[PDB]
Amino acid sequence: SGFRKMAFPSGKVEGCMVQVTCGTTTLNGLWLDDVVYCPRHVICTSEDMLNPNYEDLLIRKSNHNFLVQAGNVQLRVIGHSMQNCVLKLKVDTANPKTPKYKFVRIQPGQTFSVLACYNGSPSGVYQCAMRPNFTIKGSFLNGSCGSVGFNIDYDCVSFCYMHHMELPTGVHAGTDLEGNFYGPFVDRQTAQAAGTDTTITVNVLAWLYAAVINGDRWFLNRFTTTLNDFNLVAMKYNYEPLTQDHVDILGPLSAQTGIAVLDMCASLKELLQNGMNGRTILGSALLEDEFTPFDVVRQCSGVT
Amino acid sequence: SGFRKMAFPSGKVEGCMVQVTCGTTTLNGLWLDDVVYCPRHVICTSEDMLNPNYEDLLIRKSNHNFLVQAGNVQLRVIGHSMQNCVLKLKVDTANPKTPKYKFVRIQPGQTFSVLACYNGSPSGVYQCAMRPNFTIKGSFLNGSCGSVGFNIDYDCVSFCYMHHMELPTGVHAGTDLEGNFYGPFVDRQTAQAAGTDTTITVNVLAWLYAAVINGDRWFLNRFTTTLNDFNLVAMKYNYEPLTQDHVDILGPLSAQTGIAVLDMCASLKELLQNGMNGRTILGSALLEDEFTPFDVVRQCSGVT
Numbered sequence A, B: 001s002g003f004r005k006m007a008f009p010s011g012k013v014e015g016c017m018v019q020v021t022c023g024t025t026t027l028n029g030l031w032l033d034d035v036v037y038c039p040r041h042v043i044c045t046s047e048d049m050l051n052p053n054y055e056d057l058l059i060r061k062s063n064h065n066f067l068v069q070a071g072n073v074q075l076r077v078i079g080h081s082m083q084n085c086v087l088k089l090k091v092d093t094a095n096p097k098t099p100k101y102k103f104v105r106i107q108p109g110q111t112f113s114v115l116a117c118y119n120g121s122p123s124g125v126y127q128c129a130m131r132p133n134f135t136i137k138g139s140f141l142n143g144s145c146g147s148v149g150f151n152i153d154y155d156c157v158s159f160c161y162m163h164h165m166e167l168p169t170g171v172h173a174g175t176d177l178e179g180n181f182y183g184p185f186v187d188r189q190t191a192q193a194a195g196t197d198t199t200i201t202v203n204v205l206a207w208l209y210a211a212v213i214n215g216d217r218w219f220l221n222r223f224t225t226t227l228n229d230f231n232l233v234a235m236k237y238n239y240e241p242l243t244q245d246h247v248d249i250l251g252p253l254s255a256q257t258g259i260a261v262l263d264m265c266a267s268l269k270e271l272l273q274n275g276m277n278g279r280t281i282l283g284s285a286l287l288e289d290e291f292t293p294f295d296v297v298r299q300c301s302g303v304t
């Protein structure tokens, strides 16, 4: 028993982190096979970050201007290209530590682990979620750009996120491994709007099931509700509308506990309308939404 | 910016996890050099866990009864010994992936990362703290025994914890890598008392400094207090007494922010006496105590 914000083991991803230097800018790159992936803003100086013409800036750059380092060994760059907001640096050596991998664009509400890096060196791993407003609330400092977010399936790493930007609001924005930003964000030093961040209702419910499994049952009540009635409460509290797909996804948790999804929805409804009254659920005083039903099942069944 | 419960990258520790089987019991072992370390309760059946005579049970065991597997390769066992509550299995092969390591017994209030494992295979990494009552609040299922807790210093892994037991209260107990339990716990299936768990005051204060650094300043007030007056409030709320050593340790954080330790103590005092009033600090509705001043400085400075 016990329930924690758990990240995937990061070893497979640590073996892919390199340092990319262009001009005076140093950031992280992901080395998979003979390609190093990094944010294209590596070619920018502080001056041109206000309105960069990336295609024009890349024209002033050659393969020898991109300094790629893995640990202490310099990688030789034989090709360079821009794919959306990432640069792909072809090197002459395939990463001997390249794990089985996939590039996937995750859906908002889905979770992933981040290996925060500085100068190609990993410093920490944490679990987070792609917010419904396409931002992530991570821990990133200057130099962390190029740090990746991922999931693991047995031996296969599915890279889903590359860190690029911190908004003036202190939240983080980035891209998938094809360089497409999550959300409406652009890699420019301009005032960008994150948008309203709603609560991932299916995740809160999954965490309420995790709580019941791990003994926390105080919030369970003698009530039930309907999808339409729960969703009236959900809209008032900026929670994602719950669909039948969400209910279906919570099926294994409802079967494991014997608590019907709509009865758990009534508990959540009362928690939203009355608060916690000074109590906690899984050592938290707020409703946690960064555990998918898959994460709860996985954590409660020990999937390696 | 941003502040998360961050764990160390786990790659160095993943390369040490093996599976140890004795009789019908399967658990995790830590392979460093030619030694596999695991909880001695691997020799026990469910029957003798009520009152085991480990020395007597170990007498019925030979090197060939200990099945050690690293990935898919069987390790040959040439020696076995019991050191406190751990067994040391001498194998004929030194772990080629053995990192630079140390065995250290951490102090209560200190933090470490746990790589939760099942059948020698890692499943997740999370950050936790040794509670003042010598328990840890982790996420461990059956099969997780032998999972290790550690810290990393540049390239050196300091192993500090080996998981052994879950108490009926749902909390976790274990040993250092010399097999000495943290706390008064014994590796027996008996009713064991965790003891009163107090809040690590120096860690809450360090997290309040992390909050100020990361923009959350609402809790800062026009007041100050003394060690003796803050400690009167601390005793009432089951918080560890704050000593001058704790104040000294918070020095770099006090210098970084310009907020005197005793002024931060007055903010904490008001937070304890009045609560959060529905507000949050670093996305939490309760005072967080599992970030040491070292963890705050590290996270806010990007130590790799």
Ligand SMILES: O=C(Cc1cccc(Cl)c1)Nc1cnccc1-c1ccccc1
Residues within 6 Å of the ligand: A041, A049, A140, A141, A142, A143, A144, A145, A164, A165, A166, A167, A172, A186, A187, A188, A189, A190, B001
């Ligand atoms: O925000 C940026 C640089 C940037 C700016 C505009 C557009 C882009 Cl694509 C990138 N990167 C960071 C990443 N994560 C966390 C913090 C920072 C950061 C660095 C320096 C000072 C303040 C914050």
Ligand SMILES: O=C(Cc1cccc(Cl)c1)Nc1cnccc1-c1ccccc1
Residues within 6 Å of the ligand: A001, B041, B049, B140, B141, B142, B143, B144, B145, B164, B165, B166, B167, B172, B186, B187, B188, B189, B190
């Ligand atoms: O509690 C034990 C076994 C045990 C019992 C008495 C003494 C010792 Cl040294 C070890 N291990 C577990 C470790 N972490 C989490 C959960 C469990 C667990 C396993 C089976 C059923 C319920 C809980």
